[PDB]
UniProtKB/Swiss-Prot annotation, chains A, B, C:
Organism: Homo sapiens
Full protein stretch here: 39 to 139 of 152
Residues the record marks as carrying a glycan: N22
Protein name in the entry: Ninjurin-1
Keyword line: Acetylation, Angiogenesis, Cell adhesion, Cell membrane, Cytolysis, Glycoprotein, Inflammatory response, Membrane, Phosphoprotein, Secreted, Synapse, Transmembrane, Transmembrane helix
Annotated consequence of substituting V44W: Does not affect ability to homooligomerize and mediate plasma membrane rupture (cytolysis)
Induction annotation: By nerve injury both in dorsal root ganglion neurons and in Schwann cells.
Impact reported for I46F: Strongly reduced ability to homooligomerize and mediate plasma membrane rupture (cytolysis)
Outcome when changing K7Q: Strongly reduced ability to homooligomerize and mediate plasma membrane rupture (cytolysis)
Effect of Q53A: Strongly reduced ability to homooligomerize and mediate plasma membrane rupture (cytolysis)
GO molecular function: cell adhesion mediator activity; lipopolysaccharide binding; membrane destabilizing activity
Amino acid sequence: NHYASKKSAAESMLDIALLMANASQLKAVVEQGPSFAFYVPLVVLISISLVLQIGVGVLLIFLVKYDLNNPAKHAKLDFLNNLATGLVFIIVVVNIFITAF
Amino acid sequence: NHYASKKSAAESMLDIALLMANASQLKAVVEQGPSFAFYVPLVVLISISLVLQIGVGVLLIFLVKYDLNNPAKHAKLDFLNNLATGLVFIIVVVNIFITAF
Amino acid sequence: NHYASKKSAAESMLDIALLMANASQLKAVVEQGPSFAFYVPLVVLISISLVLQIGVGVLLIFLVKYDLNNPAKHAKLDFLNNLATGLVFIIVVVNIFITAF
């Protein structure tokens, strides 16, 4: 059944860590907020997360879904980070472009 | 008999996870709602779900119908997600287009 | 004798699952109803069901007429659904066209 399973697929079982910050700030402003920066950046952040999503999801596929086994998992987390930080490049570049425009 | 069997086919035994969110928000507004966003987006969401439906349904065919066997099913769920997230691309692009228009 | 046998043929022993919803809503409004959507959509729904009927009936011919043998029948039901959902495409497209006109 698609219930919570293909919806899990829809979420990639969890969105990329960018959308974690996105959703936290999203709730914080859904309270109320006049922030010019966080008026409508929700659309952009996921749109940027697109190209990253393939790599991050596949790199989490073979990686453990718990990630609470050990802090030593940071190395495998860092093995993923070898290009996840190359994506963080794009993330911060998107931050620069958002600030500029 | 078509009863709950070809109707199951009509629903694909469950609609794509997009329509899960669609129907939840649908009930929430059927209570009552003036939301400009959720006045009549029901038509669009299924229409978008069309092209995705073939892939998602066939990818759920050989996949288990329970999906409550293990959280480890996320990997096979993620094996489906390899292109299900490519469809999530289209989903969020549709969100962008809906917001723009 | 044609009695309940060629009448069974006339009904295809049961109409396609579209007409199940059609007849349920039909009774619900035969009670009474001012619904602009469900004033006279009975004609269209069967007319749309035409092209689907050949495939669905033949796909139910070799399939069991009980369909209460197992929930596992969903897979064979889903084997039928491989193109039954391709027909659900047409079904929802017809819904879109009905809403537009």
